[PDB]
Amino acid sequence: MVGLIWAQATSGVIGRGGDIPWRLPEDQAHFREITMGHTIVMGRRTWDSLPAKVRPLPGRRNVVLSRQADFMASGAEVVGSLEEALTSPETWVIGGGQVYALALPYATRCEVTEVDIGLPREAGDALAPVLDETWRGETGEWRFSRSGLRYRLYSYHRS
Ligand SMILES: NC(=O)C1=CN([C@@H]2O[C@H](COP(=O)(O)OP(=O)(O)OC[C@H]3O[C@@H](n4cnc5c(N)ncnc54)[C@H](OP(=O)(O)O)[C@@H]3O)[C@@H](O)[C@H]2O)C=CC1
Ligand SMILES: COc1ccc(Cc2cnc(N)nc2N)cc1OC
Ligand SMILES: [Co+2]
């Protein structure tokens, strides 16, 4: 099982300037619950977006995708292709825009947090992957984050 997990604005923006323009504690808690114990795969820019004090994310096999043969990610595995990262019962791709697009053909689950923020797309933004008609989705109710933004969880699945 390969799953993708991300949070997006209604516009599809997931990232800007190498970081994320919101932070919902409830989304972070859901992310930790879904990924804990499993392999997490991320692009090198997403690894860079994590503060060194929080890396590697605990209780998970941290895998970083990079084309740089000598890139060092302390506490993580650095691989040159996505297929090297797929040797576990459960693998979660945790970002960013490039790696979501690369991993989508392998994926059968997407856990999506929709953030009710009006954030028009801009040049340079990272975007959520486009899900075609093979995906079926189950939506949750709109909820209030303590950060002030509404959010809801989508669970997409396909065979
Ligand atoms: N809202 C959310 O839930 C999340 C948002 N984000 C945001 O996403 C943005 C980053 O996404 P993005 O800029 O798309 O970069 P990524 O995080 O997807 O990393 C891209 C890098 O991954 C490596 N890579 C990409 N494709 C391949 C390949 N086919 N083979 C080998 N290595 C490859 C390269 O590393 P190298 O250059 O070293 O070769 C490339 O520069 C940031 O703003 C981040 O905050 C991230 C996670 C979650
Ligand atoms: C602030 O530190 C982090 C930034 C991004 C992530 C990855 C992520 C978060 N939420 C959701 N739904 N999906 C994701 N792939 C994690 C982080 O700290 C653990
Ligand atoms: Co689990």
Cβ 122 vs Cβ 8: under 8 Å: no
Q: Is the CB of 113 under 6 A from ligand 2?
A: yes
Q: Please tell me the number of the ligand nearest to residue 103's CA.
A: 1
Instruction: Show Cβ contacts of residue 76 under 8 Å, excluding neighbours closer than 6 positions.
Output: 47, 55, 56, 62, 63, 64
Q: Is the CB of 46 under 6 A from ligand 2?
A: no
* Residues shown for the chain: 159
State the DSSP code for 17: T
β 150-157/77-79 pair status: unpaired
Distance CA 106, CA 111 (A): 15
Q: Which of 128, 80, 127 is nearest to 107 (CA)?
A: 128
CATH number of 1-159: 3.40.430.10
What's the distance, Cα to Cα, between the start and end of the chain in Å? 10
Cβ 1 vs Cβ 93: under 8 Å: no
Q: How was this structure determined?
A: X-ray
**Domain layout of the chain by residue ranges:** 1-159
Amino acid symbol at 87: T
Q: Which of 158, 151, 155 is nearest to 26 (CA)?
A: 151
The H-or-E segment that residue 96 falls in is none
* 14 carries a ligand binding annotation: yes
C-beta neighbour count of 153 within 10 angstroms: 17
Q: What is the DSSP string of 29-58?
A: HHHHHHHTTSEEEEEHHHHHTS-GGGPSPT
Instruction: Show Cβ contacts of residue 74 under 8 Å, excluding neighbours closer than 6 positions.
Output: 52, 55, 56
Residue 25: φ, ψ to 5°: -60, -35
Atom of ligand 1 nearest to the CA of 14: 1
Instruction: Show Cβ contacts of residue 102 under 8 Å, excluding neighbours closer than 6 positions.
Output: 65, 82
Distance of CA 138 from the midpoint of ligand 2 (Å): 21
Residue with CA at minimum distance from ligand 2 atom 14: 6
Distance CA 126, CA 121 (A): 9
Hey, which residues does 151 pair with through a beta bridge?
A: 115, 143
Token pair recorded at residue 29: 């808690």
Distance CA 17, CA 107 (A): 27
Collapsed DSSP state (helix, strand, coil) of residue 135: coil
Hey, which residues does 154 pair with through a beta bridge?
A: 112, 139
